[PDB]
């Protein structure tokens, strides 16, 4: 399977910075969602789930085709709750009908991270919508009740190594688990709509307790009211993972730089960019624009 990136006709940087600003402005405006967390967390979750279907062996899935717009992917049990992110982006797509679905879903993830004061993420245009029959089947996204061996093995399919996996999991500092979407409940920390290295700090400094929640699933709970998934707590149980957790808990700039590289790689897996394609765009935030 080859997927070649094709720039939307005649569009350049200024066009995509308008779509960025439109998403960032609505992120500011619709601030009440999910008890004032806002839409930032569910939009980086949506960008990860539309990319997270990729398989390195036959180049199926991934962000290229925008196939989440089809019933089979939209109704995957693993995507429960993401309908809220889709409905948020739907007005913006009406306003910019020329952007492809894969491009809008991955740009939503980039815009949320930067607007929640995370690192700049270079982004490239050119994903092309593909037919309903290219939609990946359900079951390619990871389970949360497993151990380190499972996480390592699962991420080899998206060829992410240990460092890339631990950097990517730092996004669980954002938002929260919702019992009715996944069978888990609670936030992982106090700052859950600002991008920081708090996931690593909380994993190493909180007193975690294995308890059973109302959906009868086990999760790790702390006195402070925070929670960790079995697959989150895995990162301090494995010796390779644990030393990278300690490195990011002690250096927030190295975490930001490594997250940026692994999140761009995640969003670009499976896509072939021609050498006459434009360079990655670095978008300015509203704050840097005085908007
Ligand atoms: C083994 C890996 C992973 C598993 C099993 C996993 C699982 C989960 C689960 C069960 C939730 C709660 C969903 C809900 O109830 O609403 C969640 C939320 C979230 N995840 Fe993951 N995840 C993984 C990796 C990642 C990665 C790599 C990213 C992003 C780069 C990510 C970003 C998020 C975000 C931002 C939320 C919060 C969503 C919200 O507040 O609505 N996840 N994760």
UniProtKB/Swiss-Prot annotation:
It is an enzyme of class 1 (oxidoreductase). This is Cytochrome c peroxidase, mitochondrial. Its EC number is 1.11.1.5. One of its GO terms (biological process) is hydrogen peroxide catabolic process. The keyword Membrane does not apply. Present with 6730 molecules/cell in log phase SD medium. It comes from the Eukaryota. The modification Phosphotyrosine is found at residue 150. The record marks 45 as: Transition state stabilizer. It comes from Saccharomyces cerevisiae (strain ATCC 204508 / S288c) (Baker's yeast).
């Amino acid at each position: 399977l080859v997927h070649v990136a094709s720039v939307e006709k005649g569009r350049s940087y200024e066009d995509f910075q308008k779509v960025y600003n439109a998403i960032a402005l609505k992120l500011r405006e619709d601030d009440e969602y999910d008890n004032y967390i806002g839409y930032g967390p569910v939009l980086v979750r949506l960008a990860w789930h539309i990319s997270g279907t990729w398989d390195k062996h036959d180049n199926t899935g991934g962000s290229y085709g925008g196939t989440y717009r089809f019933k089979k992917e939209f109704n995957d049990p693993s995507n429960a709750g993401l309908q809220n992110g889709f409905k948020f982006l739907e007005p913006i797509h009406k306003e910019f009908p020329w952007i492809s679905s894969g491009d809008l879903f991955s740009l939503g993830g980039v815009t949320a991270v930067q607007e929640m004061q995370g690192p700049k993420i270079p982004w490239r245009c050119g994903r092309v919508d593909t037919p309903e029959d290219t939609t990946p089947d359900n079951g390619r996204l990871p389970d949360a009740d497993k151990d380190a061996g499972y996480v390592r093995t699962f991420f080899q399919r998206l060829n992410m190594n240990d460092r890339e996996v631990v950097a990517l999991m730092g996004a669980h500092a954002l938002g929260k688990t919702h019992l009715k979407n996944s069978g888990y409940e609670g936030p992982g920390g106090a700052a859950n709509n600002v991008f920081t290295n708090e996931f690593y700090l909380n994993l190493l400094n909180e007193d975690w307790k294995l308890e059973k929640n109302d959906a009868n699933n086990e999760q790790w709970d702390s006195k402070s009211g925070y929670m960790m998934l079995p697959t989150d707590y895995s990162l301090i149980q494995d010796p390779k993972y644990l030393s990278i957790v300690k490195e990011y808990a002690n250096d927030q700039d190295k975490f930001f730089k490594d997250f940026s590289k692994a999140f761009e790689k995640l969003l670009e897996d499976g896509i072939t960019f021609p050498k006459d394609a434009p360079s990655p765009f670095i978008f300015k935030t509203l704050e840097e624009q005085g908007l």
